[PDB]
Scaffold this active site. Structure first.
Site, mmCIF file in Angstrom:
data_model
loop_
_atom_site.group_PDB
_atom_site.id
_atom_site.type_symbol
_atom_site.label_atom_id
_atom_site.label_comp_id
_atom_site.label_asym_id
_atom_site.label_seq_id
_atom_site.Cartn_x
_atom_site.Cartn_y
_atom_site.Cartn_z
ATOM 1 N N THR A 179 2.773 1.742 11.311
ATOM 2 C CA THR A 179 2.559 3.209 11.324
ATOM 3 C C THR A 179 1.075 3.544 11.449
ATOM 4 O O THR A 179 0.766 4.727 11.468
ATOM 5 C CB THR A 179 3.174 3.895 10.103
ATOM 6 O OG1 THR A 179 2.394 3.511 8.968
ATOM 7 C CG2 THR A 179 4.647 3.606 9.947
ATOM 8 N N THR A 180 0.197 2.539 11.533
ATOM 9 C CA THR A 180 -1.236 2.775 11.845
ATOM 10 C C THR A 180 -1.578 1.911 13.026
ATOM 11 O O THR A 180 -0.904 0.908 13.295
ATOM 12 C CB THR A 180 -2.153 2.405 10.678
ATOM 13 O OG1 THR A 180 -2.195 0.978 10.505
ATOM 14 C CG2 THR A 180 -1.758 3.055 9.393
ATOM 15 N N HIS A 218 0.854 -1.184 0.000
ATOM 16 C CA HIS A 218 0.000 0.000 0.000
ATOM 17 C C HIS A 218 0.882 1.222 0.000
ATOM 18 O O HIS A 218 2.083 1.128 0.052
ATOM 19 C CB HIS A 218 -0.896 0.019 1.229
ATOM 20 C CG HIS A 218 -0.118 0.056 2.489
ATOM 21 N ND1 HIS A 218 0.292 -1.105 3.124
ATOM 22 C CD2 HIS A 218 0.304 1.104 3.236
ATOM 23 C CE1 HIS A 218 1.006 -0.734 4.183
ATOM 24 N NE2 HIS A 218 1.076 0.615 4.244
HETATM 25 N N1 LIG Z 1 1.968 1.238 7.357
HETATM 26 S S1 LIG Z 1 2.621 -0.167 7.784
HETATM 27 O O1 LIG Z 1 3.315 -0.736 6.652
HETATM 28 O O2 LIG Z 1 3.407 -0.024 8.996
HETATM 29 C C1 LIG Z 1 1.316 -1.311 8.188
HETATM 30 C C2 LIG Z 1 0.271 -0.898 9.002
HETATM 31 C C3 LIG Z 1 -0.737 -1.795 9.339
HETATM 32 C C4 LIG Z 1 -0.736 -3.094 8.865
HETATM 33 C C5 LIG Z 1 -1.927 -4.011 9.076
HETATM 34 C C6 LIG Z 1 -2.161 -4.439 10.478
HETATM 35 N N2 LIG Z 1 -3.417 -5.183 10.574
HETATM 36 C C7 LIG Z 1 -3.493 -6.321 11.294
HETATM 37 SE SE1 LIG Z 1 -2.657 -6.219 12.918
HETATM 38 N N3 LIG Z 1 -4.152 -7.353 10.771
HETATM 39 C C8 LIG Z 1 -4.383 -8.668 11.253
HETATM 40 C C9 LIG Z 1 -4.543 -8.993 12.599
HETATM 41 C C10 LIG Z 1 -4.789 -10.302 12.977
HETATM 42 C C11 LIG Z 1 -4.878 -11.290 12.004
HETATM 43 I I1 LIG Z 1 -5.316 -13.274 12.550
HETATM 44 C C12 LIG Z 1 -4.707 -10.982 10.668
HETATM 45 C C13 LIG Z 1 -4.462 -9.674 10.294
HETATM 46 C C14 LIG Z 1 0.317 -3.494 8.060
HETATM 47 C C15 LIG Z 1 1.337 -2.624 7.713
HETATM 48 ZN ZN LIG Z 2 2.128 1.799 5.488
#
Ligand SMILES: NS(=O)(=O)c1ccc(CCN/C([SeH])=N/c2ccc(I)cc2)cc1
Ligand SMILES: [Zn+2]
Length: 258
Positions: free
Chosen positions: A196-197, A92
């Site tokens: 970062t989110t 992304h």
């Molecule tokens: N901007 S960044 O690159 O730092 C960045 C920021 C956010 C994320 C996504 C996190 N979402 C989570 Se924690 N999703 C899941 C939680 C549990 C399970 I089971 C599966 C998925 C990735 C990358």
């Molecule tokens: Zn990101």
């Protein structure tokens, strides 16, 4: 009243739901190029994307994700500062309302127009949800975007964005080759940090490439036509979806190059 990037729910508010926002290894950071030290023991990065299988593109209300099949070792990041094998799950971007801002990392306080994040998880933890619970769970490859010449390898992404204007929309997105988004040089900086989110988990080895890619003004203008809102909601353009630089604290940024 969910987190986002507005006045009432933006980065300066996130700590109330996610106290780790004020933690010891938060991202992004400013990369002070004079203070980063060359580490001659770092290895060249190994980016193996020849067998990458893209599946889908999703507007999640915060950015758009290009998702990959990560059920096998098909697109992996290895070497550099990493121990073991990290599998590509999604990429992304973060971008601005104007060409003078949009990146999350900064270089000597310089903001780029946008920043690409290729997200990978450590296969020793078996899947992504387990990996984000570990301090070495993720490796994110960060690539700056500047406005100039078009990036031909980006255009297939730009042209599907009309079909995912609003939050919750997705579209088929097969056979997209993320090698078309890489610069020539794999020279990088690396430091331990976070998502970062929200949930801002401290699970990321950051690998930030020094060479930006160039995209055209028309390409970035199409990012800025996306919406944070759902269909049939007041239009709020998806712009300035970046977290600003966080305190470095007790961390050293290492350079792969002199
Ligand atoms: N901007 S960044 O690159 O730092 C960045 C920021 C956010 C994320 C996504 C996190 N979402 C989570 Se924690 N999703 C899941 C939680 C549990 C399970 I089971 C599966 C998925 C990735 C990358
Ligand atoms: Zn990101």
């Amino acid at each position: 009243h969910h987190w986002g990037y507005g006045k009432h729910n933006g980065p300066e508010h996130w700590h109330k739901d996610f106290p780790i926002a004020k933690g010891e290894r938060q991202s992004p950071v400013d990369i002070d190029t004079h203070t980063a030290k060359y580490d001659p023991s770092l290895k060249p990065l190994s980016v193996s994307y020849d067998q990458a299988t893209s599946l889908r593109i999703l507007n999640n209300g915060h950015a758009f994700n290009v998702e990959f099949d990560d059920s096998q070792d098909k697109a992996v990041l290895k070497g550099g500062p990493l121990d073991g094998t990290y599998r590509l799950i999604q990429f992304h971007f973060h971008w601005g309302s104007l060409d003078g801002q949009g990146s999350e990392h900064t270089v000597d306080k310089k903001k780029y127009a946008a920043e690409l994040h290729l997200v990978h998880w450590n296969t020793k933890y078996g899947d992504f949800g387990k990996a984000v619970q570990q301090p070495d769970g993720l490796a994110v490859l960060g690539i700056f975007l500047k406005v100039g010449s078009a990036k031909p390898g980006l255009q297939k992404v730009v042209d599907v964005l009309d079909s995912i204007k609003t939050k919750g929309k997705s579209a088929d997105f097969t056979n997209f080759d993320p090698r078309g988004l890489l610069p020539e040089s794999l020279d990088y900086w690396t430091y331990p940090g976070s998502l970062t989110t929200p949930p801002l988990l401290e699970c990321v080895t950051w690998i930030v490439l020094k060479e930006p890619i160039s995209v055209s003004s028309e390409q970035v203008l199409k990012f800025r036509k996306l919406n944070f809102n759902g269909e049939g909601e007041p239009e709020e353009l998806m712009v300035d979806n970046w977290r600003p630089a966080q305190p470095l604290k007790n961390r050293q940024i290492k350079a792969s190059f002199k």
